[PDB]
Subunit: 198 residues, 4 copies
């Protein structure tokens, strides 16, 4: 069936002071909603293109599909990676994993921070699981659909687009990137890692 | 552990006339080998960057990692998607799936062909499974790591980079794209779809 | 010599209500300043790379140079394309040009608006002069350095990055894009066109 | 008027052994011809889009325009940057310039070589003149239209796409990149630099 805008497991304001409610609100209700509509439209244009046997606009239809489905997939996971009762550090299996792959939770965290704060333009920082080599790796995503291999399982993401913090942090994206660690919902990531490693 | 250059399940020449042995040879032994080395180097630079607590070159390290791990992941699957005893059409579950999502195997195939022949520069055509919406979709990949959402499971790919056919088809990439249907190994794709839908 | 942050020909607030002073301020003093420093650093890294005969990081040095020199070049022109005493329509040579190349100033303006409001991620809308074919064309720039040919002379640009309007228009980028027409400084564009056509 | 496929100032074979005639032939007659047609088509789609007051496909029309006009602009200059009677080193003003901006012709040349041999996918190496800062700089172009600022004047380019050497050098692009120095037509570059610095 169609793609749909998910419900947050919390109130927009629940993340203050780390993330203003106004942000979460426009983010969810305007930005994410827009991707979901775009993903569905893209899918429909394809059907219509397929029926008329007219792929003249294949390049645009395929690019619209990737961009919008990618924004949807990303925000879908972002809402879950966040939580008012989170913060602290990972635990158990996930933590031993992380320390074994990035030397220590602190070192993982320095890299991830680096990756999110150096994007040239808009993008995200994401931790994922590589199934080919069975390794935990950090990628620097450009926009929403660029810079990472096919089949990588996403575990944790940090939205670096300006719409994600300009209202509250203005140009100080380094601050926003630090504040994030207070709202990460480790029960989710841990969960995702468990499923990915199965 | 490290990433490694896989072995082909066939002899380089096994695909003639559809795909010259000389191609398969340079492709596997030179191009793919290069990605695998690059993927391992990228991974190491990260470790070294992590130890020195020096992420000054984060952008390059992350981009090298995505590009090379992506070429590796892609060729890894390409070798399996090919077979001297393939061709024909998909069967069973996969075929009903394909006809249900693209109207008919013929229509799927017209779209896929369109997607591979219109790349602007180098890229690939790929069929993948979207887990968010549980749908079969075709994407037009740019280079190796661009244009598609995170977490998409790759099922079938068609290498559109010039190195994949210039020696034999020269600039006639439309011909190469047609010849491909004779060597697709449907037992593999079908297999992948089965695992993806589980 | 080095690259330097130019002075605005006006006060930050001079564009209200169309463009808030707070924006112009962070935009000029934080964002643009950052590109200028980055452009100079990029240039230096190259010298140092050239002296040591060590181009191991060529890809990053070249990408840093393009990104930062491009942001600098872009904002440099943006400040000039804006003016408190502007608005209205182009005049003389430029206007006949524009109507002859886009049918009418109104049609040019519909296209330009379309180009700026559909960027996927961050970018700009720019009108430039193609010297090869001697034509006026509109391009949709991605980020700061992507999507247009070498040697194109830039005449007018509209910054579509979120930092350019999020504080005041929030996610309503369509509004910001309309408000812009009130502050365009046609004496500048006209001037640039004159020099480009010489 | 329309865009047109230029005539070479030489015979396809004139560059052997450095560059096979077969290459120059398919390159000029197939590849470049394709960009020119594409550039004209893109321009027409815009007119038609403008008349119907229907910019639904703005993103594709603008991307087709940039890609094809960019390939055209690039090959246009490549044919001129090449010559059977070239090679050697730059002379006069251009040479003092080059040594002053890259330390020495040898150092310029090491950088340029680095830039062309590390492209991730398809692209070019280009020397251009920055008018904002009045400096000679080397850029690493991705595809044909990406990675460099607006208004940069192109002086010399080296086509790194696989179609530019696969037939003769196969995957050994490092060799092709070396062979190029024997056919550079310095009278052209010098000329371009003169006009750019005016
Ligand atoms: Fe976002
Ligand atoms: Fe390949
Ligand atoms: Fe800006
Ligand atoms: Fe070429």
């Amino acid at each position: 069936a169609e793609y749909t805008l998910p419900d947050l497991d919390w109130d927009y304001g629940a993340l203050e002071p780390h993330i203003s409610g106004q942000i979460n609100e426009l983010h969810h209700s305007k930005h994410h909603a827009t991707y979901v509509k775009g993903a569905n439209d893209a899918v429909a244009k394809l059907e219509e293109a397929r029926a008329k046997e007219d792929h003249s606009a294949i390049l645009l239809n395929e690019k619209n599909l990737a961009f919008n489905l990618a924004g949807h997939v990303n925000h879908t996971i972002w809402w879950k990676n966040l939580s008012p009762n989170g913060g602290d550090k990972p635990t158990g299996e996930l933590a031993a994993a992380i320390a074994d792959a990035f030397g220590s939770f602190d070192k993982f965290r320095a890299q991830f921070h680096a990756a999110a704060t150096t994007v040239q333009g808009c993008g995200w920082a994401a931790l994922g699981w590589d199934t080919l080599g069975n390794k935990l790796l950090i990628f620097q995503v450009y926009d929403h659909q660029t810079n990472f291999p096919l089949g990588i399982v996403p575990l944790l993401l940090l939205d670096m687009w300006e719409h994600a913090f300009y209202l509250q942090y203005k140009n100080v994206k380094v601050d926003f990137a630090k504040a994030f660690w207070n709202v990460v919902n480790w029960a989710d990531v841990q969960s995702r890692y468990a499923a990915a490693t199965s």
